[PDB]
Design a protein around this ligand. Structure first.
Ligand SMILES: [Cl-]
Ligand SMILES: [Cl-]
Length: 126
């Protein structure tokens, strides 16, 4: 679920404000997107949204993952590292992996403050 993803971000990025920092950034950070990503972080967000689009179209998950922002999974954080629990069922594991891969991607990417709250109608249409 989305509350678990934002806790993963706090785990790998100490002292971060996940909602205020990783939503409404570039062409892809936040719900949906368009055009092409503008930096490494925006590309992490495009990858994350593509992972969620595929989750809703998987043969064995299309109904269970109708809303991936509310589907609960099992995970843990230890010394700024994320682990997706081995007890996760098929569809739970898929969404936990989408989330863990995105949180790690964000922690390695530069944060370009000039891309926060980008005019997407203007710059994300090419
Ligand atoms: Cl988010
Ligand atoms: Cl970059």
């Amino acid at each position: 679920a989305v509350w678990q993803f934002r806790k993963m971000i706090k785990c790998v990025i100490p002292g971060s404000d996940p909602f205020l920092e990783y939503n409404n950034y570039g062409c892809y950070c936040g719900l949906g997107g368009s055009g092409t990503p503008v930096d490494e972080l925006d590309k992490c967000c495009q990858t994350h949204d593509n992972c969620y689009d595929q989750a809703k179209k998987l043969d064995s998950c299309k109904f269970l993952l109708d809303n991936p922002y509310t589907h609960t999974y099992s995970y843990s954080c230890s010394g700024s590292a994320i682990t997706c629990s081995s007890k996760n069922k098929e569809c739970e594991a898929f969404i936990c992996n989408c989330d863990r891969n995105a949180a790690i991607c964000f922690s390695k990417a530069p944060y370009n403050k000039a891309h926060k709250n980008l005019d997407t109608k203007k710059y994300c249409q090419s």
